[PDB]
From a paper:
A glucosylglycerate hydrolase (GgH) identified in M. hassiacum and found to be highly conserved among rapidly growing mycobacteria is likely to be responsible for the rapid mobilization of GG accumulated during nitrogen starvation by hydrolysing it to glucose and glycerate. The MhGgH monomer displays an (α/α)6-barrel domain typical of glycoside hydrolase family 63 (GH63), to which MhGgH belongs. While the active site of GH63 members acting on larger substrates is located in an open, solvent-accessible cleft, those of MhGgH and of MgH from T. thermophilus are covered by a cap domain (subdivided into A′- and B′-regions) with constrained access through a narrow negatively charged tunnel. The crystallographic structure of MhGgH revealed a homotetrameric architecture, which is compatible with the oligomeric organization of the enzyme in solution as assessed by SAXS.
In an alternative crystallization condition (space group P6222), two MhGgH protomers are present in the asymmetric unit, corresponding to molecules A and C of the tetramer observed in the orthorhombic crystals, which were modelled from Pro5 (molecule A) or Ala0 (molecule C) to Gly446. The active sites of both molecules contain only solvent (apo MhGgH) and adopt an open conformation. In contrast to the closed conformation, the putative catalytic residues point away from the active-site cavity: Asp182 is stabilized by polar contacts with the side chains of Tyr191 and Tyr225 and with the carbonyl group of Arg216 through a water molecule, whereas the side chain of Glu419 is hydrogen-bonded to the side chain of Ser435 and the amide N atoms of Met432 and Thr437. The two structures of MhGgH, apo MhGgH and MhGgH–Ser–GOL, corresponding to its open and closed conformations, reveal the structural modifications that occur upon substrate binding. In the open conformation, Gln433 and Gln434 move outwards (with displacements of their side chains of ∼11 and ∼8 Å, respectively), leading to a concerted rearrangement of loop E and loop A. Loop A (Arg21–Ala31) becomes mostly disordered, with difficult-to-interpret density that only allowed the modelling of two conformations for the segment Leu20–Leu25. In this short stretch, the contribution of Asp24-mediated interactions (with Arg21 or Arg58 of the neighbouring molecule) appears to be central to the overall conformation of this region. Moreover, given their spatial proximity, the conformation adopted by one subunit determines the position of the equivalent region of the neighbouring molecule, potentially impacting enzyme activity, which is in good agreement with the cooperative behaviour observed in the kinetics experiments [Fig. 1(c)].
Author numbering:
A (entry chain A), C (entry chain A): 5 to 25, 31 to 446
B (entry chain B), D (entry chain B): 0 to 25, 31 to 446
């Protein structure tokens, strides 16, 4: 029990303020994903600072609503791919006037962070209440424009699933999920840049698991060749796969944002649209599932085949609901049984990223096996929102038990508990702070 | 109706404290890269609950600026180029003080010895944390024990040259409590001459507002510096030239507590028997020295102006010095506890909380918005609650801690508060209140 | 803050063990309602003792499935109405062989207590786990037979609402809800008994609010005249009203017991029936509601009129779900607005039993105004089960704040906080223990 | 892997403790309506967190059975008709003891004076609870102060007739720790004669198993009773006739702690100055009396057989008596703490938890399943942690409490546990462990 709940919350917040304190090289840029989770970690201790994190992200939102996956603080510190590689400032009609951003997106966890800010703000008085109210007044339209872009421009055919054009957009790129989609990307001659002819991809979780690095950059070249135009990307992109996990998060996020719109008297037509997308994508997720187990499947749009992999993404339906009782029960059995949380070799009953009995299991490599506390955080938060109060409590209790040595790595070896790596911000610290406070 | 839930639960409050620990940017003060002896000790106290290694790094950094004779100076300057005043140029310790450290810019005065308390919090937390962290705490003590002994030895030998068991201060700044009724009459006898012409403006503001003289008699404060410089900060010569020499009874009691604490550390970690004996000897010298000052009926302690040869009588929290270190006979301690808990201090009916006011609200010197002339400082309550616990006053300790946590639960993390309205009044460079809260909770 | 959470849990459990310690005269008999809540209060500290409380109740279950509202420990201590007045031993074909019981029922909170026992049992090992498993193996059939009796014999016309034949069956008799139904009960000459010609009703919450005591006993005489025969009661009873609160609890209880059957591999046909009743009664509750506010209405079956009263029973739909978003939002506004929890004169934001602005409001008289912590407990537990995690948390936080003086009365004056009375067992202690532990 | 969550959280555990407080019916023991002096004190300690009035009623009931000379007897019988043995018939105090209370059946021996500790827990909790409950606690003290003084005065005057500062026991039962190596050699010198023929079976079992002689030498135990009866329990005559007279150094230290605690209560509630002075005087008499027994190198305390005129040397937790009351010179206290924390006691590597074993596992007398010959009693750890806190040993106190709570978290609430396996071994009439847990948490 190396840290008590107060000591652990103190250590988590210290490891979110980032000052003084192997660790990773920290860059000044801002990540869509990290921003949402820092906001969730911040809301317990500072609503103002949580609001500033989202305000800063959202001021880099594209004019069509897309939130890009990175916002660069500059173009000289050698981050790759950087502003020079993406070139959205000159190429994309919708890149913002005064911000440098990438040209891909990231899962819509943002409405979850907004809900955390508003919930914590309501218990804190008048001044802080008005800070959260002011944020909502200033950013509701932008959150709506983000959800509307995903629904209209990444579900052009109203199938209720979000289409990804890069594994990087999933949040879960070093994963078995995409291996077969990526295997059909065959790159040509990459153009000549001023960067080296072999520049290392800076974020190591974004490196391809087999150094097939041209594949990843070739997708960028296809995006740039149509200037990131959402109307033209389906004609030229070599990677087009409907991500069923992203889709379920989107459904949850639409339901959360609708409930926010009703609690805070937002325009009724927006609430209706939000409710409608939430049910559209709930059905889209369910449409992918196995008839026996309920497991969700990603869909390779180009290959026209259900991708079949044994990762945590299978459990997408448990986040957003929609399964019939029998198949939801089936799927919970899978989640809690020996292929996942009940695998007898696991040190803790957190969710492994890939099933230890899968052929693709790699106990040390990112989402191919290792345990990520932020994944268990997300399930526990979604379970509580679905009414699975005691399932949510047991996950939270298990996440805290694992986190209480105060290591705060972002992923751990699923059998030995060894901490395996840290991200730019500590998603695990944010998960622990939300769990405790 | 039963009290409403505070803005912050204990885990939320501990998180907010850890987030703010090295400065409340959440009206905020101007932050400098320099390191303060007092702030460093309390940041180390706040850090030990959440990271022993980071706490150790804070004291390692301070102690590497120790003077060759053992004095820990009140500031270590990160640079002499950002305009903090008085800075390296005004102090000129690097050229004038033989004992100033070779590769470190510092001031030439000292600060209360709360460091042994910080070391005790580091070692106490480290013991519970597994052998790797236990090792970083033992490595620290092996490397810094000599240094902590030499600090205490300097205070006992050079600021109590006549073995009276009280620490002599050459400036109100050395007390940690400068803006206070305690020193007004001693300052009123400092009469500056023609101050030398420096390269700064002749009007140059003292950067730290808690250090500005309450009356703007700023020449007085800077004149004491010139006296120190005139004798090159030589401990043998300062008593001949300083216009300010007062025995600080609060500093003296903290020193007594510190020697006792360090001595217990020295035994638990097989430090040299001769150091421990010395430490225990000083702890008793200064305990009795504190008691020697006390009022015969209330037990209240008194500072002593060495030059005026006069017991200074003021009604500030410094009167309760004997409660920290012990030593009072039983009936005067009860008397003094009655004074502390009664209507002149914690039981004053206008106080929002029962934390200790820095000056008694019924005193003529009471100013409810000015630093130590009345306002409530959580770090003072923390210091009392920690000392009460070590004296075996378990319930008194518990109730101070409870009351400090009640007051901190709005998350304001100011260093001092209006004692009647609870309005937060100012922040220091590091948040001592955040450190107090982290220790109380962690 | 007169008691800390540990001190308050200790005091609550002391005031549930009943020994040593104005207060009420405690009788050796066992109440259906009190038994369920004592079990909920006991599960945190002793699963075994919780199981013994329900086992003891259920061994007095009638052969048709009805759980009676009282189980008498004897017929000599002068409780009235006692075994001699009810006479179910000689009259009712289904009264149990070796137990003395009343001839009326009580809301089905029992499945909620069973869920608390199983949840707490799972975290406590092997021996205690087997104790809860053994209970379920022994009592699942009986819980099914209780739910089946309510659905088949108190909803004979499959309207999805439970019919009551006595205000005493509602759990909420001293209430504005029934005043107009009771006003149409006109009694004849009551038969001669050996008891006095004026025996005080022992439980004071069961006394009629206007000493029209003959009305209450006359209903008993109608039940006895057809020997409590469920097939004949609708022909002879002068009080027949569909209780929409009881109905919503029943729906929640069916959903809870179905989820129990799935977690603990109970027979699948039972789970199907449970799910079916849960949705039948959810719809029945919704069918009563106001088109503007969503407020639920009780139905007087004989008068054929919707009873319109401004009590907490209006909020029945919030317990079991089923309203459309707009009307659920409307109804939450009513609950949280100035007619109820946000009435500015209330000392705490617990739910008043009747709206302070209603004409029927009586700030000192049982369910006509006063604040009952067990009512707020039930809403908060149902809210958490519906996913309203932060609404559940704020109610629980408010209930604890009110309870932390350690007074443990069952109801309080809604404006001054004055404790107004104690029941046989402390439902409030059970609520506090569940909230804390 | 990081430790798994215990069967009970602190609120659940506090609830379970309060539910069990007056007897673990959840293998359970046979419960009698009688009241035990020792159990009554600890039930009052367990009750104060949850009900001051109920705690006050528990001591009021005990104290109404006090003898006219101040002795609190170890049992108050609710009746003499349920067959508890030895009962009113065997003790015959109602006819033989001039000082036995008029309308209350009691035994004729005493028990350690832990009552002042219970009073301190009642008053401490009452102070925080509002004026109505503050009033019921002041009313109790007004009514029972004389009585508590007369109890302490009886112990100081009649069980330390020669002002040696140690309490003389006339039976192992009076120690609260009868089934223990501490008394084996003193018992081995009791040689019974023809025991008188009573109306019970000649074989009649001692009802309380912790009171049965370990060796079934039951004649010895009952023979001491006959000696007491032969002199009508007269304090002046018992030293002439008793075959068992040993100074109990643990009882003596608890008495010293008790006098100190009661004296602090007497000042805080304006009790008579002469009572407080007496209390402080006895507290120091018995502190020094305890220290007088101690080993010269370890500081371990020793019981003294008055008749054999011999220091009893046994390796039980009673050696640590000086840690409770203070008084040891600094270096022998460190020695004795090294013994307590080291491999013969808390640091024994085979122990499941670091609670204090009743007998050292390396002793030849160590029996791991037999009462005080080895097993772990949470109430002993509670008593040490409470005394450590009053001595200012804040961290040692905290770590005992933490360790006791760790061990109690399975909810077993036994009074003593196998020290190697943690297996619960037996319950008393009231759950002292439940009271310890409620105090630690409440």
């Amino acid at each position: 029990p190396s840290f008590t709940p107060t000591q652990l919350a103190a250590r988590a917040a210290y490891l979110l303020r980032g000052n003084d304190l192997a660790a990773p090289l920290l860059y000044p840029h801002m990540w869509s994903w990290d921003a949402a989770f820092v906001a969730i970690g911040l809301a317990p201790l500072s609503v103002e600072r949580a609001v500033v994190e989202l305000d800063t992200l959202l001021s880099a939102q594209w004019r069509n609503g897309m939130i890009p996956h990175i916002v660069f603080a500059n173009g000289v510190d050698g981050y790759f791919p950087g502003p020079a590689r993406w070139a959205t400032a000159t190429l994309a009609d919708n890149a913002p006037r005064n911000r440098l951003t990438s040209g891909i997106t990231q899962p819509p966890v943002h409405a979850i962070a907004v809900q955390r800010i508003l919930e914590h703000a309501r218990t804190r008085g008048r001044s802080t209440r008005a800070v959260a109210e002011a944020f909502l007044d200033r950013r509701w339209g932008d959150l709506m424009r983000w959800h509307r872009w995903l629904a209209e421009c990444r579900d052009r055919n109203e199938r209720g699933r979000i289409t990804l054009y890069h594994g990087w957009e999933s949040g879960m790129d070093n994963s078995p999920r995409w291996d077969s989609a990526y295997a059909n990307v065959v790159p040509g001659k990459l153009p000549e840049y001023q960067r080296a002819d072999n520049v290392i991809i800076t974020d190591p979780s974004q490196r391809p698991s087999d150094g097939e690095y041209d594949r990843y950059l070739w997708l960028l070249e296809e995006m740039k060749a149509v200037r990131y135009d959402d109307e033209r990307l389906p004609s030229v992109m070599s990677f087009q796969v409907e991500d069923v996990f992203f889709s379920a998060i989107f459904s949850v996020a639409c339901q959360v944002l609708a409930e926010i719109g009703e609690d805070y008297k937002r325009p009724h037509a927006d609430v209706k649209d939000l409710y409608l997308w939430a049910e559209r994508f709930r059905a889209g997720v369910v449409e992918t599932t196995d008839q026996r187990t309920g497991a969700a499947r990603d869909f390779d749009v180009l290959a026209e085949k259900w991708l079949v992999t044994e990762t945590a993404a299978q459990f997408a339906p448990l986040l957003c609901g929609g399964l019939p009782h029998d198949r939801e029960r089936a799927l919970l059995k899978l989640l809690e049984g020996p292929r996942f949380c009940g695998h007898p070799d696991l040190k803790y009953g957190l969710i492994p990223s890939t099933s230890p009995v899968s052929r693709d299991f790699r106990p040390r490599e990112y989402w191919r096996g290792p345990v990520w506390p932020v994944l268990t955080w997300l399930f526990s938060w979604c379970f509580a929102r679905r009414g699975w109060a005691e399932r949510a409590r047991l996950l939270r209790q298990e996440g805290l038990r694992q986190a209480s040595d105060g290591s705060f790595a972002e992923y751990y070896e699923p059998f030995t508990g060894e901490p395996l790596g840290s991200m730019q911000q500590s998603w695990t610290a944010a998960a622990v702070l939300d769990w405790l406070g």
